[PDB]
Symmetry: D4
Subunit: 162 residues, 8 copies
């Protein structure tokens, strides 16, 4: 059963959000992926958020750029935790995306990650850490993955040419 | 019949939006005022936008601060022209408000005005200019008001003490 | 009869503003296009704005970059509604364009759209929505166009490879 | 048993973080509060993070301003989910706090909330939503609290004087 | 004969521009002061700039805030050198004023000074230096004034209490 | 006799400053060009500024990027008018260059132009306008050049393909 | 013998730089304090930097705001290590001060500290750490001071009221 | 004996930090180079900083990008002077790197250099200047290197083609 859903405002956002799905493939975490536009499919946004709890989602990762309203509007319609990923926009390099997501008012939170691909991957890792609190097997896989990243850096201390 | 509606995300926004209503009092333009929160009353936002055309509104002026989603979400749900006013936020001085409103994607526009009270007043003036295209009497009142502002500056060229 | 005029500060601005004209071709809205420079042809700017109402324009879309004075100076010379499009500048990525257009003082409004091509397209859509208030046929075409955009997203929910 | 810990870099941060504790008092959520400085008590930071899981914490809310390293360094030392609150700094108004917290690299996430008191309150609400996934009673209290906020706005639509 | 004119967009700008006039009083430089609004008195702006050379002005100092179009539009209408002073705006602290003035395109220059009162004083000093090139007496007064400022700093090297 | 000197911090700045020299070639204005580094040749900077008046310079155009100290330090050492051109830096896109030049304190002015090549060309035009005040022939050439730029825009009003 | 010199651009900078002197009083480090203006006393700046090594200075702490040229120009004239403190400016809140100091080009470094009073204190601490490398007694005093700061935080973990 | 250590958060940082090592090769200064990640190898960071004094390091140059915590966390764990180099990040062009490093609180300083390669080279030059205070031979080599840079600019005053 998919306990996490990855949503984005447009198909072009996949170039960024694919990095969230990559973490789940590595950690073997079942997940749903779907394009839900706050501005082009506002009604679908409402129906998606309203049925999130019933559909079994415990965490929702939402990505959007520019006037990024997707994460916040989903968070306004459900109690399921929402994590937001600011997609890098052309002109403002994601600052508009960042401000539109992180500056939510008291009462409707959205846990925001870094701008771009690093944030997409981290949103998945955070979702995994949340799930891992009640999933011993996943907790172990996260632990092993973290150790693997640390060891790679430790066994290669000199960045200069051989 | 009220052809324009002034909406805002919170009652504290009235300190800013009251300047939009002031322009309408001066120009004798019937208007509706209401608090519609994108995050605290998402369902009311949808019902307000869906019935805007039927309620007779030809222009909607929406004000919000921070992660200002109100103008854009209304614009996504109706063909009635939407004008957005960025309320000045504490930490980011309205830059977050500005970015969240003006950076709308292709297909769902929001005509954005200046940050703060100047923008609120201008949103009302712009709405009035739009209405004035098919209202000769209002067009005349706008003309007289503009002349009055120009004359005040012209009859007082020296800013120094008397 | 052309009820909307698209003006820009330089011919190089056409790479951006062509997206406004594209919306009008799609919606079958007669329009005028012309290069009017606030700094290189200041007198032409004044004559263009002064005769706008008599020439039948109900909405004026003006695009400019850098110290973008074109939209505001036109708005200062006519009661015809003015929509401004900030062209993306090299060094400041359109922030200078945005500030010079959106920050107009009380009394002379300019409805501002997003930086770049998205804003150009949206300025045309907003102008169309304004016209649609008194044009049932255009209102229907806008409605059908919006439905077409929504349906495209709805019939393609999975962004991943086939 | 306290399932959430609220930590901050300095005692002066309490003026902001007290709003996180307020949400927990309202929702009846047991919590721990402590000053842990990344720069003045680096060793305590490591010991706090290392024992977080054993101490029963399922969510950690960390607040800091300026070169805000506290949230990220805790996240680097534990798998327990970390939420970060950017405290508003004097000179940069929290932009430095925001960048130092949200821009974490791939592998070590920190779910970031808004700058200031709104973010502190939201970090607590997000932590509550996370806990609510496996706590039916808390889920109900969150639901009732949200309804109460919505109703207050709905029963007071006119912001003007009586 | 007044060889320099100090103009500003509004009477409220005098709180800033008075510092330009102060330099001229100190240096005994005849000057004209007047409120010329680019947006409220566009026609007066054109007539002022067109007659500047005939009126004997060799330098024009123009101050404005927000969407500061005054300096640039004057520069577009005359060959008399124009110096611009960005007035500090509330929300954007003069960054909008600065961008709207300094970013002029190739062909129409505006020599820009610092944001606020320091810039107003410096615009007058720069105008004085320009005049001083062909005015030996003024050149001497500028020299003596500069020496006086240097000496004050030199005779007070210790900033601590006596 | 060269009445204007064009100086820059490094030879790589020539890619930008060459546009200032281009204006002088077009207008037939004798000029000096030289690399004077505030940081690599501080003593040469002082000797250049000290002898500027004696060498016949009436205007000095100085270009620099990053921590752009060149214009201001020259202005601190001479009464000859100094115009500054902010060169576009890689990381901050000239904002650091702009701030380091335009924000000069009361007493030592630097007339600042736009970031990059547009500013370089404009600094030369401004210098020319300053000289033109006492040079009827140059004033005429500037007039003809401006007319030529205006006419080019006027005879090509339609930006679309033929 | 004073091994460190604290210099600033103006006497008003003392409100900030006094915090650097405070650290030296606490640590018992002999120091010189003087007002040296890059723009008002350029010649004094050169003589101060040229004689720094001969006067026994091993570290120079320089503070300035706005177009902060003082630190960099001193660094260009001496091999004695220079530390820069950005004073908080009114309009740009020290961002101009920060950029003008930190962005020095290859060859002439300035170790930059935080904006404002925190940076002033830290510049003194850094200077002390540099001296401490060859001064066992000072190294011990720095150690004891750091322990004292850590202990204060450790003995007061609960920020709430008693 | 290596008196300086160059550390960085990731191997990809070497493209920037190699310019620090280049200065040391030119000046013949023994140095250590190593990858120490604040987020991926937090324990190694602590052990590296704790043993820095015993390992003979008198200056530590640390480079990092994004949420750049490396320099500050090292500085919190040792009295050895720490110099920080902000690596240029993709989205924010090093502004996040700069803020996370320079804004350190009172008590734990980090001398910060420019964003990118210029800063890396300057951090090495500053470290060299610090060492040169007690190393006459190195002081001479630094002097000769500086003279060489100055002479290159002096013998090539004309940037134009031959």
């Amino acid at each position: 059963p998919a306990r996490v859903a990855i949503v984005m405002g447009s198909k072009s956002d996949w170039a960024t959000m694919q990095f969230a799905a990559e973490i789940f493939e590595i950690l073997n975490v079942p997940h749903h992926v779907e394009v839900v536009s706050a501005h082009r499919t506002p009604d679908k946004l409402f129906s998606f958020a309203e049925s999130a709890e019933e559909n079994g989602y415990q965490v929702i990762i939402a990505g959007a750029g520019g006037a990024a309203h997707l994460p916040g509007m989903i968070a306004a319609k459900t109690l399921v935790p929402v994590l937001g990923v600011p997609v890098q926009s052309a002109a403002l390099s994601g600052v508009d995306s960042l401000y539109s997501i992180v500056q939510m008012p008291r009462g409707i939170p959205v846990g925001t990650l870094a701008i771009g691909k690093a944030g997409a991957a981290n949103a998945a890792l955070l979702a995994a850490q949340i799930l891992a609190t009640h999933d011993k097997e996943l907790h172990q896989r996260l632990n092993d993955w973290r150790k693997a990243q640390t060891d790679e850096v430790l066994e290669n201390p000199d960045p200069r040419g051989a």
